Amino acid sequence: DRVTTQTAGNTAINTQSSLGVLCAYVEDPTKSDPPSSSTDQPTTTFTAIDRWYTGRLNSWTKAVKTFSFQAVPLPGAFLSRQGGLNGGAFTATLHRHFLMKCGWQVQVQCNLTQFHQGALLVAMVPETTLDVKPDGKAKSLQELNEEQWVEMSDDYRTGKNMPFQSLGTYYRPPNWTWGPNFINPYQVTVFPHQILNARTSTSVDVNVPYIGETPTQSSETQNSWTLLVMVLVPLDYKEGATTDPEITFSVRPTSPYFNGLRNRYTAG
Amino acid sequence: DRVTTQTAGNTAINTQSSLGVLCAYVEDPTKSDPPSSSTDQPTTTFTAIDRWYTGRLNSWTKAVKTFSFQAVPLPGAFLSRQGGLNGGAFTATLHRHFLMKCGWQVQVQCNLTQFHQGALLVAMVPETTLDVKPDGKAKSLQELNEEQWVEMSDDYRTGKNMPFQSLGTYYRPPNWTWGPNFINPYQVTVFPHQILNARTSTSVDVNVPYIGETPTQSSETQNSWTLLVMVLVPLDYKEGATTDPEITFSVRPTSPYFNGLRNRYTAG
Amino acid sequence: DRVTTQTAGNTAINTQSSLGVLCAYVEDPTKSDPPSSSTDQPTTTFTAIDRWYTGRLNSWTKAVKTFSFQAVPLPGAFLSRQGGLNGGAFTATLHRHFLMKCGWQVQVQCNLTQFHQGALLVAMVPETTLDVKPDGKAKSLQELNEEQWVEMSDDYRTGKNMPFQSLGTYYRPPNWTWGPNFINPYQVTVFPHQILNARTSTSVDVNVPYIGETPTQSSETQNSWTLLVMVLVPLDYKEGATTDPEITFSVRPTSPYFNGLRNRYTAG
Amino acid sequence: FCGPMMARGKFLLSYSPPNGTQPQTLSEAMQCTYSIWDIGLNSSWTFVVPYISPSDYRETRAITNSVYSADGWFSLHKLTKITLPPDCPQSPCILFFASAGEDYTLRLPVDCNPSYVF
């Protein structure tokens, strides 16, 4: 049963190496109630947002070290058009509503074949500030193109580089040492995940529901789910094989609830 | 029963001089089927587009002659933001779908009182090219502000000034005399209409279904319904009364069907 | 179920990449009546002609252009011993009967493997004069060896080169432009066919019944079915791979009826 | 897909409704009706172009190039690059077929074009 073609709206995506769909942490992340904390009528789903959206990540290479990763914030990639992920009607609905609640269906494709070795960890990781620089501003697409991969080091292991409020001249500047948005890179397999091994498959499936600190969250600021693509085993091949395989990803929202209908968002 | 507050979504509009709602040409212009000519799933209504939208017309004056009029194309006023009619999620859905089918609920407000005389004909008129100049280009908001009212004359009575294809240098240029998009100004009361008389009411209600040459029409080009506000009796008052009463209008779409989901419209 | 060994008489042919047997245009091309137009007792099938016959085609190469093809006329390949296709008792029965009616079971083998790309269209095409030169004489085996593949060009697309009667010196010689035995090369997939793709299989199966303008036809002249092997995608491989893969074909007649028993055919 | 069995890759097949400008960007193709096709055991993908028309019927021939005759564009984008082990041949090829759906219907026979005979 490795051939699966999954249909949503007017978009159908196909794979011939399906490992199955990782359903965590409920038996169906589409089974869900109207959000109890808002009393206006929610804007529910319709068939032009009941569809998949496809974007591009940076190329995986021999030079990419172990545990180097790419971070795709959701819904932040739609807001920033990261990797060409234009969201159409879904992004148009995002910019016009104050609250947003949904789960996510994600599929990441990478075009491996035989005579190649390597493994990619593909996880949906709650909750990250990995899309943000240590100065507190979000990464631009130029900066995401210049990395080309985020290197694991002392920072991002301990949380030392997470965004912070400066204390000011009144206080002594403290030695920042630790933070709770660390990545423990050996433990990323606790999250809803699959492994894109070169040996066995070209695509992976993860299916996640809505989670949050509140039964709905603000459309502009939430980062409750993040598509993390992390190298476990580096790429190796002999010369004459395909250099620089590409990584694409396909994102579908599940059971969206929109609240607080208002005009298009303009920043301050 | 002159006090009516009509509720739609998060928007409620009120009047204390209600003449009733003109339901033409069916007993309910909300009773309607999925459009049979497209086989994709339509994008149906939801509670953030199930609401009213309000815009401003130009001021009515003593100097406005008989049968001078203002033309509000629907959905063209949303596309052009005519009179400040920002449509939010509805316009965002319009620009992202190839087909659009809906009816309309309209209410026009004008703040008359006693010691004033005059009458305004408020009709939904199918089908007009009255928003377009005789050269074939649509009127800009600067030009709509400069008119400030369209004067009835020999053109617009006979259809002589309607948009046309020029024959070119090969042919003799013909004497253009007549066209089927005429206004016969004495006969505008055949359309679904009410009269905003200064004597009896400050607001009027007209409710119309979808009509067309096809069971759905293109979102960008259709002008199947037009809100026409036309002077029947000119304004007169003694000095000391309120000069220049304002005309506002409120527009609600009924049972929208959207087809052909695609990216935001960019002109050629 | 890709491993199939099909048995007929004393001959059994095997494949481990079976795509199934294309049964067109009836559910079984073996289900068939005694031919109603001849009243002598027909010579029906027996176990030494209820068998497969195997022949060789020319080698497929990198230099073979798109839509270049080989034509195998049936039963003409048995009469001409094209590709070493000796037919034994079946050809001995063909030369001694005036009428012949049968269907055909064909299987074409080509020894591809991995690290090769290309596709071969294998179709049974009614009805062709592709085995005949434009002067009206049939191709000899020396000429079929010298081609080594028939190139598609302006002739064989329009039917301009099909065999014809010359008008003689009495008439003006006309500009020959079109003929109904054209090949439209993009449309050859209308016929009972399979595609010998290098990716998925090494052999293809097509099963066809008898057809004709009459319920039986002359043994010597009929060309009601022709095995057409046509290149869709040219061969490409890196150096060190197997140069020049061979193409073989296996032919079995189904439900033969022979009429008009007489001596061995001698041409005039 | 007529390339070698060792080849792996992904393609995005997108159908666009009519627009003022034809989409070229993969982000623009992602906003349209699209399906992602994976290279694997099954070599073929059947893409059904949806019937999205303002009228019940559409014109076969685009005389004036109106909305009733030209129903947008189909486009092929590569999602990921095709990856190959060494000694595979470069540049594999995708073979294209056109076919009518089971709901396809034709109306009003007209005069033929005799251009083929000349």
Place this chain on the structure above:
Amino acid sequence: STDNAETGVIEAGNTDTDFSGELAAPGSNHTNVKFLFDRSRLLNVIKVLEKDAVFPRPFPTQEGAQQDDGYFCLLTPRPTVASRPATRFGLYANPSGSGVLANTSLDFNFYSLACFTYFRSDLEVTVVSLEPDLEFAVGWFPSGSEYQASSFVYDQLHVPFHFTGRTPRAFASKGGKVSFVLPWNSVSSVLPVRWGGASKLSSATRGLPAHADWGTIYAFVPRPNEKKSTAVKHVAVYIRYKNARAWCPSMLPFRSYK
């Protein structure tokens, strides 16, 4: 959806196979074979006989042959030359030269939608004069038959034998039209649209069927041979296929991209 085109079978899919939607409702049936071909179209333009003809000789015709070209019309969709069946269609691009310009004919509308290998139908024939107010008559003889090429004398006026016979003769009024339907008269079961066989065992031409026709028609003036003027008159031939049936799906002609 995933498939293998190498199978040779592909299921006709719908919008609901991969995406969200439904079947478009059927609304026409004009692709029916019995409906499509049942319409009249111009077959050929023939000259009108004013005397007893000499039927055109078989090919290759040599110099000095006394024969009447351009008067006989084969009722074939297949290409013809000099009232005899042909394989290649031929035309004349330039006027200059010396020799006889042979008549050639095709049903372009048929081959634009054949699209099949075998065909059988009855044939409505309609005969329209290209000259105004012409009094004319139509003579037909079936497949396998031949023209009776002689005359008989009545009151010192030569009366040709094609005014009579057992095969249908239809006299039009002055400025009138002729219309009648013909059965499938061949020895063969069906007409081959394309053919690979040979009619003879020796010296035949491959792809030229002998009896893929509904017979031959000719136009003649119902006046004896003594009444003649130099002005040649012309007649157009219309054919319509009745109860058309088709077999063995096949190709449509190549369309040049220039």
Place this chain on the structure above:
Amino acid sequence: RGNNGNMTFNYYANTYQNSVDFSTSGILNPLGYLK
């Protein structure tokens, strides 16, 4: 009815003498109502 008087006998079938619309799956009405 229309401007038609020869009601007794029709030679051609209805779908040849007229068009008919395809399936998808006096006393006068007022053109306006008040609520």
Place this chain on the structure above:
Amino acid sequence: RGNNGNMTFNYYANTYQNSVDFSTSGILNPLGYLK
């Protein structure tokens, strides 16, 4: 049916208006099958 509308009445017998073949003694079929 074919391109025929005058269905009510036929003047000539079937074996004169058309040919018929001699005795010897919608929903669409697929043109190909897989085993």
